[PDB]
């Protein structure tokens, strides 16, 4: 079961067909919200989301060929990015708005409610209107997904002769097959040879500011953890963690 | 890095 | 704007040209440091270097067409960034080492003598192999970095269509370089994208590296130039 | 407000 042997067109139907489901949050939340009460609320649904996650992964083209422990520190690296990407993305038709779920979509208003959260709902919702505005495609974006579980934290990763060196060159392969597919996805679009080498850096650019919401939204669930107002939920409690060794 | 593991262990 | 009709070769001439000098730090053969030395050392350099940084900025084709805010904008959310590449680039030809200055290359080893500073120079460390392994060059290099210049505060800022505008250019100038050096269409898509996901490591490492500087300024080892706690404070309080 | 920044880009 080789990766390095699919198509683009193989790749791209792997990636849609590993898609999680879009996640409901708690019906008929008390409004208004709380600052333990939306903190509840959207890590109540990370925690649930990051389940879906993992299994969704397992089905990322090459990911099941890496070692646990490198399986472990991918995902560890890039939960948070690869919960914001997806946030961002189901947002994308709603502007000024953040659809954390069909029965939750905020705005920046909402953001307010907990303390130092609205900062990271702007950077959000600025990109949601950098997709919107780009018309980003769904095959894009289940590939952008895919670089960023491999990506993030492959070169966080140990060296230790051909060993490591190994789990490192086939990661290196797979974001090339990556990077092949999404310009065969705009070259099939009729985007020119220029157009399709501007677009490309466009959307990569994305996952810089991804990468940064990601350590702020850290930082601050961090803070939220020490402030006592992040309910017990273990699994997000583990993950949030392996980002303070 | 307990549950993760277990999960991703899960066959 | 202007720097919307240079060509790839005066896109390239122009960085080049905009090159800040490489500084040295205080002279003193005292080794090994101490936590408030080394991070007196490193401070120190960082200040001065962000001087020749602004003067950098003002010469990349299409800053200085944005209004004041928005120079300082983008300058504050990437200043870090921008020292980082450049660290890393100079470390390219001492692999295991970071070379701050001339007069100033450190080991690993040495970053330990800082309490958190080892985790920041591992990751630096990595990102100089990278490049390495990658046998980035010089005029990738500059295109690399006006990039995070004007991209990184790009949203979180009409201006915004101008940056994108040069931003896109700066792309037609990285493929242009791959081409003209032989790269087949392919390898020069994939290499383009290999340079760009390293700008999301960089970006880490500068979080990771802010977050430590305002730590390191809460438990004061020593006190932080004008400048730099500036620069700090735009994303702190 | 007054920022070093601001004179340092106004040269
Ligand atoms: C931005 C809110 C958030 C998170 C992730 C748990 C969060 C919650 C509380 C904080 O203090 C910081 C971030 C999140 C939840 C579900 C998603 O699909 C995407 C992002
Ligand atoms: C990583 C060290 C560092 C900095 C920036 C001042 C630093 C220093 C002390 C800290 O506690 C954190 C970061 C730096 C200094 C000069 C450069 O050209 C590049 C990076
Ligand atoms: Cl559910």
Same mark, same amino acid.
């Given at each position: 079961?080789?990766?390095?042997?699919?198509?683009?067109?193989?790749?791209?139907?792997?990636?849609?067909?590993?898609?999680?489901?879009?996640?409901?949050?708690?019906?008929?939340?008390?409004?208004?919200?709380?600052?333990?009460?939306?903190?509840?609320?959207?890590?109540? @649904?990370?925690?649930?989301?990051?389940?879906?996650?993992?299994?969704?992964?397992?089905?990322?083209?090459?990911?099941?060929?890496?070692?646990?422990?490198?399986?472990?520190?991918?995902?560890?690296?890039?939960?948070?990015?690869?919960?914001?990407?997806?946030?961002?993305?189901?947002?994308?038709?709603?502007?000024?708005?953040?659809?954390?779920?069909?029965?939750?979509?905020?705005?920046?208003?909402?953001?307010?409610?907990?303390?130092?959260?609205?900062?990271?709902?702007?950077?959000?919702?600025?990109?949601?209107?950098?997709?919107?505005?780009?018309?980003?495609?769904?095959?894009?974006?289940?590939?952008?997904?895919?670089?960023?579980?491999?990506?993030?934290?492959?070169?966080?990763?140990?060296?230790?002769?051909?060993?490591?060196?190994?789990?490192?060159?086939?990661?290196?392969?797979?974001?090339?097959?990556?990077?092949?597919?999404?310009?065969?996805?705009?070259?099939?679009?009729?985007?020119? @040879?220029?157009?399709?080498?501007?677009?490309?850096?466009?959307?990569?650019?994305?996952?810089?500011?991804?990468?940064?919401?990601?350590?702020?939204?850290?930082?601050?669930?961090?803070?939220?953890?020490?402030?006592?107002?992040?309910?017990?939920?273990?699994?997000? @409690?583990?993950?949030?963690?392996?980002?303070?060794? | 890095?307990?549950?993760?593991?277990?999960?991703?262990?899960?066959?």
């Amino acid at each position: 079961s080789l990766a390095l042997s699919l198509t683009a067109d193989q790749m791209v139907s792997a990636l849609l067909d590993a898609e999680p489901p879009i996640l409901y949050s708690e019906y008929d939340p008390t409004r208004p919200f709380s600052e333990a009460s939306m903190m509840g609320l959207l890590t109540n @649904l990370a925690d649930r989301e990051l389940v879906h996650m993992i299994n969704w992964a397992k089905r990322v083209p090459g990911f099941v060929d890496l070692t646990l422990h490198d399986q472990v520190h991918l995902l560890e690296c890039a939960w948070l990015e690869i919960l914001m990407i997806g946030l961002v993305w189901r947002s994308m038709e709603h502007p000024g708005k953040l659809l954390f779920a069909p029965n939750l979509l905020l705005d920046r208003n909402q953001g307010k409610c907990v303390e130092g959260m609205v900062e990271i709902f702007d950077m959000l919702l600025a990109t949601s209107s950098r997709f919107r505005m780009m018309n980003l495609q769904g095959e894009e974006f289940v590939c952008l997904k895919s670089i960023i579980l491999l990506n993030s934290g492959v070169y966080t990763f140990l060296s230790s002769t051909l060993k490591s060196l190994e789990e490192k060159d086939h990661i290196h392969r797979v974001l090339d097959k990556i990077t092949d597919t999404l310009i065969h996805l705009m070259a099939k679009a009729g985007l020119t @040879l220029q157009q399709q080498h501007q677009r490309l850096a466009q959307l990569l650019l994305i996952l810089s500011h991804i990468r940064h919401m990601s350590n702020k939204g850290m930082e601050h669930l961090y803070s939220m953890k020490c402030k006592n107002v992040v309910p017990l939920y273990d699994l997000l @409690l583990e993950m949030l963690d392996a980002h303070r060794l | 890095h307990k549950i993760l593991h277990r999960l991703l262990q899960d066959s």
